[PDB]
Curated annotation (Swiss-Prot), chains A, B:
Free-text function comment from the UniProt entry: Synthesizes glutathione from L-glutamate and L-cysteine via gamma-L-glutamyl-L-cysteine.
Region (Disordered): 29-48
Domain of life: Bacteria
Protein name, as recorded: Glutathione biosynthesis bifunctional protein GshAB
Pathway: Sulfur metabolism; glutathione biosynthesis; glutathione from L-cysteine and L-glutamate: step 1/2; Sulfur metabolism; glutathione biosynthesis; glutathione from L-cysteine and L-glutamate: step 2/2
EC code: 6.3.2.2, 6.3.2.3
Subunit (UniProt): Monomer.
Record-linked SUPFAM superfamilies: Glutamine synthetase/guanido kinase (SSF55931), Glutathione synthetase ATP-binding domain-like (SSF56059)
GO MF entries: ATP binding; glutamate-cysteine ligase activity; glutathione synthase activity; metal ion binding
Catalytic activity: L-cysteine + L-glutamate + ATP = gamma-L-glutamyl-L-cysteine + ADP + phosphate + H(+); gamma-L-glutamyl-L-cysteine + glycine + ATP = glutathione + ADP + phosphate + H(+)
Amino acid sequence: DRLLQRSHSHLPILQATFGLERESLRIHQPTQRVAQTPHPKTLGSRNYHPYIQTDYSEPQLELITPIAKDSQEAIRFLKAISDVAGRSINHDEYLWPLSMPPKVREEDIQIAQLEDAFEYDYRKYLEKTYGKLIQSISGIHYNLGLGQELLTSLFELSQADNAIDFQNQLYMKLSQNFLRYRWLLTYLYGASPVAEEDFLDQKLNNPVRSLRNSHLGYVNHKDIRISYTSLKDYVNDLENAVKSGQAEKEFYSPVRLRGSKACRNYLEKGITYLEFRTFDLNPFSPIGITQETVDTVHLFLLALLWIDSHIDQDIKEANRLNDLIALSHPLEKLPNQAPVSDLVDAMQSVIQHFNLSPYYQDLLESVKRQIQSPELTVAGQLLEMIEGLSLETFGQRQGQIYHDYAWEAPYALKGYETMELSTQLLLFDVIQKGVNFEVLDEQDQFLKLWHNSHIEYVKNGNMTSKDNYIVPLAMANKVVTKKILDEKHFPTPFGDEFTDRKEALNYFSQIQDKPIVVKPKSTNFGLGISIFKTSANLASYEKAIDIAFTEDSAILVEEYIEGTEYRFFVLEGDCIAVLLRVAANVVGDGIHTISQLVKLKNQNPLRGYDHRSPLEVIELGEVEQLMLEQQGYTVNSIPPEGTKIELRRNSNISTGGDSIDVTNTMDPTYKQLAAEMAEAMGAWVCGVDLIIPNATQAYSKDKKNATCIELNFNPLMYMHTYCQEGPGQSITPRILAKLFPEL
Amino acid sequence: DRLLQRSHSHLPILQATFGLERESLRIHQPTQRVAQTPHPKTLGSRNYHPYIQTDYSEPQLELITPIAKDSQEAIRFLKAISDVAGRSINHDEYLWPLSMPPKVREEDIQIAQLEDAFEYDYRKYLEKTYGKLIQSISGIHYNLGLGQELLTSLFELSQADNAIDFQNQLYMKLSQNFLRYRWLLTYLYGASPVAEEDFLDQKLNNPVRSLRNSHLGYVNHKDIRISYTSLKDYVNDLENAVKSGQAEKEFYSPVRLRGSKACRNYLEKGITYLEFRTFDLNPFSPIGITQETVDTVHLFLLALLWIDSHIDQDIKEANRLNDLIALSHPLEKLPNQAPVSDLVDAMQSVIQHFNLSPYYQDLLESVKRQIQSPELTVAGQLLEMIEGLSLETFGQRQGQIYHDYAWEAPYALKGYETMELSTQLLLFDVIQKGVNFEVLDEQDQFLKLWHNSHIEYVKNGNMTSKDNYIVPLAMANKVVTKKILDEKHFPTPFGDEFTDRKEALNYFSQIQDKPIVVKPKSTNFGLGISIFKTSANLASYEKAIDIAFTEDSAILVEEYIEGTEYRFFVLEGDCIAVLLRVAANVVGDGIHTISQLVKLKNQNPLRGYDHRSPLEVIELGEVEQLMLEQQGYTVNSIPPEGTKIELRRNSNISTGGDSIDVTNTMDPTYKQLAAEMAEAMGAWVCGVDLIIPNATQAYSKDKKNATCIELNFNPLMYMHTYCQEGPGQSITPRILAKLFPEL
């Protein structure tokens, strides 16, 4: 009715709140059948989990996304959740991509096991009324709510009566037009051509574009009717027509009013948001839906407002059309009856009127092309895949494929590969274990996560309330950390940094005979690091100092301690792992040129070139070649069997170095020591770095066996779990469990 | 005896631990007499204060320095302590520069009031034995201990018998040679020519170089004798000769063994360090001693070891020489008897042998020059100053002068003008209130301070344990702080930063009609800030964005809120002050060219060019001139009466802006609000920054009266205490008091 499209383009029509719910059947691959298995022990209780749950049957898995500012933010949410679910599921099982089930078993569909008794009776009640089999069909729900600013600006132009009465009018107008033009959305994205056993008799009928949206599929209580003319009409009709209700949850409409506990309870408080169910899982998107699909639908929803007769008659008429479009064969074009020009013009008009992105023009044009040739529609891609009126061959094929994808970069969280690996893992644990979370910053790796009343702010993976206050204070310092350690009678090196070459020599006077290490504070691979086991000559020392300044602003000068460097990760009071790092290298095989040996080592999945990963790819760089020539070999030369050639002088993972889990070989005495050192800083999750000359021999202070070179209060955790060599150990889960003992 | 000078130059002879104790009489200027006043109420109890105390009389003030790595670190310590003492003393009183008293009053010298009863009896006991008058003489004590590394390396060459037996031998050798050649130190730095009343009869005798070191001055118990041949001999002789003891504290020697509770108690545990008392307060150094004096003495002490007969005879012989040198007239040269060539060669030899700094060669050469012409000696400068055999005219003159110095830069701590003003003040409070402290970093403004068992780590003045953990975590962020605030329903601007111009326009879509402010994250004076009260045009907006990138890496875009910006300082739960800042400016006086007006405003002591200070000097820079031309005026033009000319577009103290204390004019409602906002971050010492359009009108959320632009968790505190206009309020003391409720 209202024409606020008339309104100024400065208004943000695109503003909205998105939510995304996905249901899929867990499929047992060997048995080619529904899992018939318990909800995984890795996932977080079905009682509190916000993102992952079970819709009706125990097999049917539902992933619910937190609320999202953009369509984009919701999609990523769906991706991450789907990924956690991918890797949390039993390895034998996989997720069923199609809306239609794989095979039909009344026995297999067993009401999900829920602790709440009332849930059981309602699920039971539901089972009796419609039967177990219908509950198996899966789909995705699209939940949209309009931006307050968008709504408030719209409200100001039309009338001054009520935030709530107005919203309601608007929401109602939308739902109505949604039902009216829904057929289009169903047409573009029909994903349900056939059923293996669900459909009692339509094999003869043949493939239809969308069974799920079809009359025959989950459309009971034909007698039940709700007038959508007004919120009151819908609300009065719904309450009174409580037969379907058995509250009003049992009512099954294409678009459900939401944010309201009971129909009419919130008529007073407004429609919080509308939720759409028209969408059918899509086989080609791992998550089940595509961005383009999401934003198209968005503009489509939007067209309706712009394109604001009799609600009762027209909506009734459309069901005929929608069913017709739904029942129609995939390649078969849309009827002449459909008011296609009205929806297209509208969307076009919206874009033209509001100066929208060419991206939305790109989505409309694709919509038009599908109208031009039907294969383009989701159904058309789909038709070829179906064989013998069964896509079960295909479904298995896609479901397994996608399962491999879920396991494709085990370290990365599909939603968030941009962020630090350490945070990604933590985030993974959060999603599977059911903690609620907000990425407050992302860029800063800042997270807010909470369970119920309890809230924890963590930054960069391991920066938490548990760490004592001095840690954040001294985190940058290093020099300070040494002092409180030194005051605690702990083994330390003797070095002091000097700035601007200010009397560095005076320091040189301080330390001469003693082996010295000179390095810039930044301390990269060591493009600028100067190390003298030999006592530095005064001239030699000056040049080393000056290179440091060339490389960076602050020069660090330290005692040299001969030993092998190891990283201890301490959590609470106990060292949870230990790691050795070595300079990038390859070992000679009679057969292969060094260039080859490298290429071969880079074939490791952990080494990542395109995406950041636990290990870095080895590049036979200039720095490297020289190292090669210096060993007397060459990129081309072929090394001897078992001859280790070293590519980089100093050991770093970033340079392509190796991480080796040493937790079980390391002498326990030093693991102890690393944790006493963390205890002395009250650092809950610190990472200690000892230089140990003999890791087999036990540590004795008398022996000055070990000396703590550094102490990092944002240890990088992923390095310990994913190593070139060694087993590794899980770090991210343990921290989170300790953060939230309840959950 | 031992000749470890023979040892390799790589050994650090210079390594040592220094301490410095200074005693001065508080002098009442108007009364030209000893204060006769109670130890100040500003200072920290005489019961626990480590740095500031009273030696014998209540007037006599003693400043004790923590222990110092360099001579340099000790001097600065002395400076800071002397400065705190300068400004803590009553304004009427001042510190007496000369060792000799100003006037002599048996009545005026009243035993210092100490809570401990035993102290009283010992002070009483002391008063009866030697009388009140002698206790008034003041001097500085020089405490040196040799570096363990220096001692351990020395120990290794000579023998393997004992850390302790060896140290003892060494220490003993030093003290003995000290007594033997002490005369030289007394000669160079004699500062006691005459006494106004102390000296009963030597006016006829005439000016002597050093009365304080003279036999006649505080040299009682002539009968008492201690053999210094051996530690045992000194120890046995001392215990038995307990007559002087009345423990052994009453024994008064030029060099006292220290670090040992009782003579011989620690013979088993070693001489911890030697302490020298030869030095007499020096009139020309505000602190009473000079670096050159300190390092010379250092090499001198060192000569003795290199220059390692009969201890008893020679030490006895020297007292004759020392007294002679002490008694001798200031201009009068050193006797032919003095083995000057031996001490000089020795020091020379030390320098030559150990490859020491030319700086030490510079100190020796000065020593030689004083030998050449005696005026150079401290006494010679001094002789001219004394008039009518009384330097009391001079002492008043110097003491007052120095008092003005103590008050010279009230904001700066003389020891530490290098460090952030906020930290300097805090440090001041620490020193006067008697808290113990270590500057752990200095560069990072990192402090460890403690009282007894209790320890607090503070960084940058106001970073403490009291601040909740999220603050250090979110301190950098700003964007994060907004969120937890926004979640707490607090008034906020609508801005979001975009990085690398990534869809900034999309944001521009988000905000168009709304007044916008665009600025780089760095946010300097605004060399790169672009502000549009006017809605930004798309083209205009792009250029503003791009300038931000030219100026800095991250671009910030925010809502514009019209109002005047104010800084609230919140402590615990209560806003303790409020400040307005305005762009640098000058007001027209018919008479003066703008260049003049500036020069005149820069005459303010708070504006600092040479040293950093609460206010910055105004420079008629290019940026400024243009602002001038733009107002249509010019550096040269003469402005109208009361016409405010604005030098800088945006208001900053750094650019030369004005700080104005607004604490008492500000509407209380907003002071409240700023503290609720700090409470919501659990920020103990945060600094809130509101934009308030009407500071006289009360704040109403309905009115959206105020909006919190920023929130700083390292507020800069000095700005509030020292303002161009307004009274200001003390911030540094209150924080420290709350940190340590006991002290």
